[PDB]
Each structure stands twice: as C-alpha cells, then as structure tokens.
Amino acid sequence: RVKKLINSQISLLIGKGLHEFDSLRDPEVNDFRTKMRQFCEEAAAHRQQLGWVEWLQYSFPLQLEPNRALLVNVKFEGSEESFTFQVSTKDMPLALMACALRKKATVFRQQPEEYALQVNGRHEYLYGNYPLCHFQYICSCLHSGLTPHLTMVHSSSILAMRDEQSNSLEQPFSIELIRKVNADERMKLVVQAGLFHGNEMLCKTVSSSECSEPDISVCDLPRMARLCFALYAVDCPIAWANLMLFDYKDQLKTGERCLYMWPSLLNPAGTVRGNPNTESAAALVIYLPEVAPVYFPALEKILELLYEHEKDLVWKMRHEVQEHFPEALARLLLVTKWNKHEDVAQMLYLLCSWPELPVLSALELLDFSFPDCYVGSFAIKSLRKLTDDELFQYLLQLVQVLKYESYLDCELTKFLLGRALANRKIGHFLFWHLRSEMHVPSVALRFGLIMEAYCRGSTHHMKVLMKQGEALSKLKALNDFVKVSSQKTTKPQTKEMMHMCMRQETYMEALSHLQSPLDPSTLLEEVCVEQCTFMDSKMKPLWIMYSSEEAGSAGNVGIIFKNGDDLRQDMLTLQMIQLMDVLWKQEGLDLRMTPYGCLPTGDRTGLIEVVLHSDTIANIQLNKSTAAFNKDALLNWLKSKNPGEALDRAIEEFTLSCAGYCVATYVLGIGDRHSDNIMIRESGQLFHIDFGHFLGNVPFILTYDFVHVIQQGKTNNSEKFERFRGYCERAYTILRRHGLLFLHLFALMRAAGLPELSCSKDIQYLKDSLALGKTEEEALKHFRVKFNEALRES
Ligand SMILES: C[C@H]1COC(=O)N1c1cc(-c2cnc(N)nc2C(F)(F)F)nc(N2CCOCC2)n1
C-alpha cells in the first residue's frame, strides 16, 4: 500500500491517471516507463548519500550575480536572540559565520565550516567562496537599502532535511492507400503524401486520385524518415497525419496502420503520433509492404560504409570543414544529401570524430532542421557544458524541442530528467513546463510520462508540488466564483464574499504554507485575506497577498492568479528581457530591469509575481493627494517617494530601466504600450507589464513624460538626455553581439505553437530589429535614425 498511495498521488499531480498509460498496451510507452523509472530511482539513491553541502547545492542552489560596509542581522536556529554584525560586502559567508560564532560564544559564556547561512523566511542559502556582494540577495539588499537577515543553520540540521526527504534492396518506396471523413459531398477527397527528413522533402509530394467513408529507394530511406499525409477536398483542408517509417526498435514498420488524423496542406513538423480521440477523428487506412525483418544498420556497419555549386564545394571539402571550421557543422549537415545512404554514412562518420561545439552552436543543432538522432546526440553531448544557470535560462526552449522528438525514450528526455533530478529548481520548472501543457492532446502522453518518471526519483518533491497544485485548484474555484459574483453585485460586495470563501478551512489550509510555483525559494506562508482582491479586467484576476513573521517584511509577497488567458507569450517575453539583463550585466551594464515571474500552470491558467511598491503611469498621473501641469505628475510622485538626497538616485534608476525597456520593447517588437501597462517602482525603476503582442503583431518609442523625468524636469537637458541615449546605444550594441543567441532560441520556440511566433516572417523581424546583416557601425547609425525619429514624435 506504500505504492498505491504514491501512484494515486502521481496520477493526481500530473493530471492524468497512470491506468490511462497501461490501457494503451503500447510496448513503446511501457519501455519508456520501466527504463526511465530505474534511471530516476538511481539518481534518487545517489542523492540520498551526498554530503550536506552537496545536498544544499541540490535543493537550494546558490542565487548569484551575472571595499564597502554592510550591517547584517544574523541569528541561530532555536533562538530568537538576533545579533547585528558589521561585515564588509567583500567578505565571504565564512567570515560572517565566524563573526556570528564569536558573538555567540561571548554571550553564552563559551567552527564556521559546519554551518550555512539561510535567508530568513526563504529557501535561499549563502555558502561558498563568493564575496557577499556577488550573492543576488546581498546585491538586492544593498540597492534597496535594507539590512540582510540571515540564520546560522548547522550541518546536523541540513542533514536532517536530507534524512526527512527519503524515497536492403533498390525497391522504390511505395504505400497502399486503402474512417470518418467530414467534407462537402459535392467535391472529392484527395490525399497528398510526402516523404520528409525534418524540413527537407526526400522526393516529391505524390498526391492521390480525386463521401464520409473513403522516387526514392528503400535502401536510401534515412533513419528518421517521416511519411506525411494530408486529406484535402477538391482548396479546403480537412486533416493531417504523420508517422515514422522505422519503429522505436529501429525495425522498418510493415503491415496495415490506422492513422487517427488531426484536424486542420502538409504538416511535417507535426507529431508522428495519432490523435487520441479515436472516436470522432477522421482516420486514414494505409499498408506498409513487406521488405523481407529489416533493422536500420548499426553504427559499426554505418562507419564502415548557399547556391547549388556552393553546396557541392562545402561537401567536397567536408573533411577540411571538420579539421579547420568545426563550428560550420550545421552548414555541411544542411547540405548533405539525406536521401542517399552513401552520403549519410560518409557524413555520420565525420560527426563521430567531430570535436565538441560551444553551447551557441549546440542550441542551433537542436532545431527541427536536424532530425538525425546521431547529430541530435552530438548536440546533447555539447549541451552538457551548460551550467545549471544557463540550462535554467534556456529550459523553456528545451521543453518545446521535445515536441519535435520522434520517439518517447530520447537523449533529450534523459538529459532533462538527469539535470532536473540533480537540481530541485530545475526539476521544479521542468515539472511546471510539462504540467501546464497537459490539456494539449499531442503532448499529453509524452509530458505525462516524463513527469511520472521524475516523480519516481523525487517522492518528497512530488509532495511539495502536490501542495502547489492544491493551491492552484482552490484559486480556480475562487476565481470562477469571483467571475460569477462580479457580474451580479458591487465590487466591495464581491471582495467581501471572496474573503469569506477564502476564510473557510478548506481554503486557509490549501492556500497557505507552500513554495511559490513562480519561485521555489519564495515561501508562501500565511495568506492575508484582508489584502486579497481581484482586478476589474475580463478574467477578474486574483491578487493574493502573503505574509511570514520568520522573514519579516521580505515574507510580504504577492501573486496573481489568472484563468482565461494564455500566459506563454508573456513568460517568453519576460525570459528574453531577463536574458538581455544578464547579457547587459555581463558587459558591466546594469539597467535596473524588473523581470518579474510569470508561470503558466495549466489550461489558460498561470501566476504572475506581484512587484510591490509600484504603480502604473496612469495611477500616478491621477494622484490621490498638486501638479500645475500633468507633465510634472511622475516627477512629483518620484519626489514623494524619494525626498532630498534620494531623488537623484531615483531619476538615475528611471533613466537606466527606461533605456532598457525602450530597447527591449523596440528589439522584440512589443507595441501597444500605454500608461496602463507601464509601471514605476518607488525606487524610480520603470518596468512593463502585459506582453500580449510581440514581433510587430514597431518604431522606437520615446515618451515625453519619461523624457521629462530623464531631464530632471528641465525643458532643455542635453547632459541628462544624451547620457540616456548612450545607455540605449550600449544595450542595443551588446544585444546585437548576441543576436545569434536570440535567433536560435526563437527558432526553438517555433515548436510552442504561439500564434505570434509561427513562420519565418516573425523570425525576420528580430533580424531586422537587431540589424544583424549590417556592420556594427551601419547598424548603430540605423538605430540612431530610428531613435532621432522617436524624439521628434515625443
Ligand atoms: C497594475 C495592476 C492593476 O491592474 C492590473 O491589471 N494590474 C496588473 C496586471 C498584471 C498582468 C500582467 N500581465 C498580464 N498578462 N496580465 C496581467 C493581469 F494580472 F492583469 F492579468 N500584472 C500586474 N503586476 C503588478 C506589479 O508587479 C507585476 C505584475 N498588475
């Protein structure tokens, strides 16, 4: 009964019963299940014998940054008696722990290596040989002015958490086209079939001969060949269906197949698995002739065997390309004749001795343009260099790429699960990236199986994620109530009844004491029902506040629950802005950005992190007790929050972040920016919210109200204004240098099916906004023309 409880909890957590998997009687699903279960359990066991600092690295990974004084409050576990030391920002955490043990021995009338520093009320720790200034928490405290509050956790306490979290021939390829079709009975049904190796067509779309019931050799068919079908009417499309010619066991598939079709001509990128709705979906009846069994040649036997003329020169000096331009691998792989086994064996032989490639080259090889499993394994082999922080930075894209995957057991799934089971922060976001897509039939089996496998290697983490899902379940029930109620009573009345609903023990228990799905290190402790509310927008989003005594003012955390809108594009936009910030900070440029959390959790559902101490441009402009001129409202609000000496740092914070968001919204093509979706923090930091439109679905924007604040309220201020232009120019030139990184990641995101990231037209927008094909001088002059055009429009 220890397994019956665990399995039913897994079913509940992943949003799919484990019985649904068994009832498929699918040897592939069964073989992924048992192989991945052992893989995950091995990792769980390796983790149960790690050292206490290694366990800290696992569950609470360090939050770092991409000579000065510091007052720090430090206390111990099991004692309210705090102590305020005065350490330097250049000191290591071990120096503070020695200071704390010195003050502890002096009071209690009495070794810092057996201790770790916990950030109060958070699952965040400070340990290692890193100066305090470089820990994100100390950095954030220094800028905010706040005193860092830490707790001296001993090794015997950390080890108790580890001990509490236990458990053949030239015969040309041919098909026989032998069902619930719904189309105009007056016209006729036609099926178009195409052979594909990724994007590349292996031969030519062999269509069919024009009711409700209806040039390639077999020896040259590549390992990952796709037979792609399209049911049209004769141009109105009806359905599509794809399948792999070779099975998961490398054997060539033979005999009849029933292809359950997806409703819409050819969709090569679409999954190679049938529609699960085997009741209403249209089906195609096909037959695979008998070649003999024939299993795709092994690596041992395989290794034994731009204009048109430019591609033939790249292929001729293919060995010179490996030995002198190894990074040009994708250029030669994209020129290889994938419909000729003779050239594919010669090309795969080169890839077997090809040196490793930088992560930027590996992220390119993960695109759909490279479906070969050998070239794909080489990509994950180069992708292991990825640091846990870099892997987190691209985790969303690596999850979308699983949609291109042709079989369930794959080296990307093995890698993602291996890296997830070695870091609880990576296992956390991998969980939510898969959980949030469980309502999508095409990914539900794949994602459902991965989440199950992870759960086998993390039974304690499953219980922690269960607590999150229960909170999200209650938030949907409270949000549906709020939607119905708001259409029938005054807002104050609905707010009072939302609070009574929340005050029920079913809700107080479920909504309290959980890790935030937006950030596992933020602990959501007591829900402040008096401070919770909903916004007046269509989906009545909930504004939920939390407090924690243990963390003081830092435990005051807000989250926004939204049901009814897709949050993926917002998440993507924010991740890109965070990447820009990391790139800018890597080149010594801190633009004081605010890349707050956005995490989709389910069907048109997700969370948004509340940034407290901020208001919208429109609310500051309609102040609540004056400005003689509206142009002075923002500057006056900044004066209200930053008296005397402080006003200068606030105008600087505004200038830097304004330059960052001006460049980010410009480069990413984010339009429809107005006083409602632009906010200012009391520090001066300007940031944007609600990114429902990107890639021009856009000129540089210079708002007069912001230029007035940048100019310290002066009508003419070239010293201030031109320093601002320098920031825009630097941030735009740093992002241009990493243009290939955004293009590769955006190319990987084509797998997500976001409507504003659909064809090459959308990717072209980024190339033009980043002016990549130009020299750095010509691009900077072009940006200058578009920036000067924005000041005149201001
Ligand atoms: C200004 C406040 C008041 O009325 C709002 O609507 N507000 C919103 C709205 C939103 C938001 C952002 N993106 C998307 N797609 N949707 C929303 C919403 F919650 F409305 F659904 N976010 C905030 N933030 C608060 C400050 O820290 C960051 C998050 N506040």
Swiss-Prot record:
Residues 534-540 are annotated as: G-loop. One of its GO terms (cellular component) is cytosol. Its EC number is 2.7.1.137, 2.7.1.153. Pfam families: PI3_PI4_kinase, PI3K_C2, PI3K_p85B, PI3K_rbd, PI3Ka. It comes from the Eukaryota. Residues 169-289 form the C2 PI3K-type domain. Its main location: cytoplasm. Pathway: Phospholipid metabolism; phosphatidylinositol phosphate biosynthesis. Residues 306-457 form the PIK helical domain. Disruption phenotype: Null mutants are viable and fertile but display defective adaptive and innate immune responses due to signaling defects in multiple cell types including B-, T- and mast and natural killer cells. Keywords: Adaptive immunity, ATP-binding, Chemotaxis, Cytoplasm, Differentiation, Immunity, Inflammatory response, Innate immunity, Kinase, Lipid metabolism, Nucleotide-binding, Phosphoprotein, Transferase. SUPFAM superfamilies: ARM repeat, C2 domain (Calcium/lipid-binding domain, CaLB), Protein kinase-like (PK-like), Ubiquitin-like. GO terms for molecular function: 1-phosphatidylinositol-3-kinase activity; 1-phosphatidylinositol-4,5-bisphosphate 3-kinase activity; ATP binding. Belongs to the PI3/PI4-kinase family. Phosphoinositide-3-kinase (PI3K) phosphorylates phosphatidylinositol (PI) and its phosphorylated derivatives at position 3 of the inositol ring to produce 3-phosphoinositides. Uses ATP and PtdIns(4,5)P2 (phosphatidylinositol 4,5-bisphosphate) to generate phosphatidylinositol 3,4,5-trisphosphate (PIP3). PIP3 plays a key role by recruiting PH domain-containing proteins to the membrane, including AKT1 and PDPK1, activating signaling cascades involved in cell growth, survival, proliferation, motility and morphology. Mediates immune responses. Heterodimer of a catalytic subunit PIK3CD and a p85 regulatory subunit (PIK3R1, PIK3R2 or PIK3R3). Interacts with ERAS and HRAS. This is Phosphatidylinositol 4,5-bisphosphate 3-kinase catalytic subunit delta isoform. It comes from Mus musculus.
